[PDB]
Curated annotation (Swiss-Prot):
Any GO BP annotation: DNA replication
UniProt note on regulation of activity: Ap4A hydrolysis is inhibited by fluoride ions.
Domain of life the protein comes from: Bacteria
E.C. designation(s): 3.6.1.69, 3.6.1.58, 3.6.1.61
Cofactor needs: Mg(2+)
Entry function: Catalyzes the conversion of 8-oxo-dGTP to 8-oxo-dGDP, and 8-oxo-GTP to 8-oxo-GDP. At high enzyme concentrations, can also catalyze the conversion of 8-oxo-dGDP to 8-oxo-dGMP, and 8-oxo-GDP to 8-oxo-GMP. In addition, catalyzes the hydrolysis of the diadenosine polyphosphates diadenosine hexaphosphate (Ap6A), diadenosine pentaphosphate (Ap5A) and diadenosine tetraphosphate (Ap4A).
Entry note: cofactor: Can also use Mn(2+), with lower efficiency.
Pfam families in the cross-refs: His_Phos_1, NUDIX
SMART domains tied to this protein: PGAM
Organism, scientific name: Mycolicibacterium smegmatis (strain ATCC 700084 / mc(2)155) (Mycobacterium smegmatis)
Binding, Mg(2+) 1: 34, 54, 96
Protein name: 8-oxo-(d)GTP phosphatase
Domains as described in the record: Contains an N-terminal Nudix hydrolase domain, followed by a linker region and a C-terminal histidine phosphatase domain. The C-terminal domain is necessary for efficient catalysis by the Nudix hydrolase domain.
């Protein structure tokens, strides 16, 4: 009943792609790279780290590919998997991973010994993998709304929320975030300011994506989400709890995309995978300091 949290990846390069399959001497197994989350990592951060450590490759994460669980003496191991596009590197054999083979999917399917790995690979080929990514982030914890009407424009992140913001840097960088947007509320800007410092980039202010604006004019909000998503790069858009569910649900509904997980917590992230402008995945990631 105790859960050991882990993450891994289908690491690919180039139907036309090759995927990485590893061998480990300790188990004599052929599998997909994965590993346990360290203290304070989220799944995407651990996936990217483990890919680097076990294969030698840096990568950009894309679509999430489901969850595998299996029993271990400690209880239950849970592994969430991502598609990860290689951005270079070289494997060197060691005592932990002595071989790495790059294989087309069909031969990878035969090489992989665990039925659960084969299911992850089936998910991987179900949809495009050369995707662009929009990251929709609910701002971090910011104390409690006041007694006043509507919204407190300037209410800042609290101590927990500032730490969420710092913890979102690595998570959002795991997906190759390049450009930054925040609704016209101080708490939304503050959530992505650590990432803004990291990238040395400006945050574009988005008055059409605040709670008040969405309630006044939801079509303008939807149109602006698509405008942003259409630009080159992988945008991060930080907004509010009354806005996100509605935008996500509308997009999923119209593109017939089924999210495997649901939520709307402060500090959470929706990873929206796009192929030639079409939505092909919608993956809800918990806040960095929650399970
Ligand atoms: N996908 C799977 N389904 C069922 N059993 C598995 C699976 N993957 C590994 N195992 C088995 O469970 C045991 C532990 O393997 P696991 O890969 O979880 O160990 P590990 O050394 O902690 O690796 P990691 O650090 O990569 O999470 C091994 O005997 C292995 O064969
Ligand atoms: N005075 C209020 N007026 C309207 N809605 C409120 C008020 N207080 C709380 N809420 C509702 O509760 C939710 C969370 O309120 P809370 O004070 O915890 O967070 P918040 O930082 O304003 O969140 P968000 O910016 O995502 O709405 C809001 O999204 C809103 O739906
Ligand atoms: Mg491992």
């Amino acid at each position: 009943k105790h859960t050991v949290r882990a993450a891994g990846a289908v690491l690919w390069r180039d139907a036309t792609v090759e995927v990485a399959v590893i061998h480990r001497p300790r188990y004599d197994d052929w599998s997909l790279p994965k590993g346990k989350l360290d203290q304070g990592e989220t799944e995407p951060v651990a996936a990217a780290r483990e890919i680097h450590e076990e294969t030698g490759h840096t990568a950009v994460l894309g679509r999430r590919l489901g969850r595998v669980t299996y029993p271990i003496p400690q209880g239950t191991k849970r592994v969430w998997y991502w598609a990860a596009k290689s951005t270079g590197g070289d494997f060197s054999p060691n005592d932990e991973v002595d071989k790495l083979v790059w294989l087309p999917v069909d031969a990878a399917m035969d090489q992989l010994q665990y039925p659960d790995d084969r299911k992850v690979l089936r998910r991987f080929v179900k949809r495009p993998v050369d995707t662009k990514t929009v990251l929709v982030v609910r701002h971090g914890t910011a104390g409690r709304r006041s007694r006043y009407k509507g919204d407190d424009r300037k209410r800042p992140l609290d101590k927990r929320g500032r730490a969420q913001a710092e913890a979102l840097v690595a998570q959002l960088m795991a997906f190759g975030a390049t450009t930054l947007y925040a609704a016209d509320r101080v708490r939304c800007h503050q959530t992505i300011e650590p990432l803004a410092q990291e990238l040395d980039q400006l945050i574009h202010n988005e008055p059409l994506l605040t709670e008040e604006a969405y309630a006044a004019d939801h079509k303008a909000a939807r149109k602006r989400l698509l405008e942003i998503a259409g630009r080159p790069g992988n945008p991060v858009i930080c907004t509010q709890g009354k806005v996100i569910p509605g935008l996500i649900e509308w997009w999923c509904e119209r593109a017939k995309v089924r999210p495997e997980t649901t939520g709307n917590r402060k500090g959470s992230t929706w990873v929206l995978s796009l192929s030639d402008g079409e939505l092909v995945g919608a993956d809800y990631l918990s806040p960095p300091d929650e399970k």
